A = this chain, B = another copy of it.
Amino acid sequence: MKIAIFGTVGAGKSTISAEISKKLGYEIFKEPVEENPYFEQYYKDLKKTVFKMQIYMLTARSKQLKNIIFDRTLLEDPIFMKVNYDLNNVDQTDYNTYIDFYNNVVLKLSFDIVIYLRVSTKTAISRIKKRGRSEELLIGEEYWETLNKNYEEFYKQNVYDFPFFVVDAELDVKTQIELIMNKLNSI
């Protein structure tokens, strides 16, 4: 069973992953933020850092690819590039470069279930504040709201093409996990 955990920043992906790991005994595929050489400076200037960061993300995720829970997937990385292009942090040319580059260089990738931890931006932000990553504290709400909208739109455009299972991430973790295990056991 290949379990994808899908959702925006502050959705609770790593918490949910850990809880599923506890119950099934599965390995978690994580990409640790502390090992990301770009993270410290990323949010200080998006215009300067985005492209470099997003190529790094593709690389790192690909090496992990060479019974699993995926704490965020490679499907999600282009969402972050799209958001920065929407917010003019990336121009048309750089976006084309990455996009073409994503399909013709980066792009098995099969998941038994893609768990979409759908969450309001408000809750996502307060989870971000609670966690207290200094780097994430810097950018404003518009960034988070744009990203969330982009996560929902990715989901709507791809709903038929992946085995999505939507989880209300406003619910408390015990409930989320109970709904997730019930779903996993039924398949």
Binding site for B on A (CB under 8 A): 37-38, 51-52, 55-56, 58-59, 62-63, 66, 93-94, 96-97, 100-101, 104-106
Contact = CB atoms under 8 A, between A and B. Distances in A.
B59 A94 contact: no
24 contacts: A37-B93, A37-B96, A37-B97, A51-B51, A51-B52, A52-B94, A52-B97, A55-B55, A55-B97, A55-B101, A56-B97, A56-B101, A58-B105, A59-B97, A59-B100, A59-B101, A59-B104, A59-B105, A62-B105, A63-B100, A63-B104, A66-B104, A105-B105, A105-B106
A94 to B, nearest CB: 6
Q: Is the interface of A mostly helix, strand, loop or mixed?
A: helix
Contacts of A58: 101, 105
Contacts of A66: 104
Contacts of A59: 97, 100-101, 104-105
A122 to B, nearest CB: 35
A106 B105 CA distance: 6
A38 B55 CA distance: 17
A101 to B, nearest CB: 4
Contacts of A94: 52
A139 B38 CA distance: 29
A100 to B, nearest CB: 6
A52 to B, nearest CB: 6
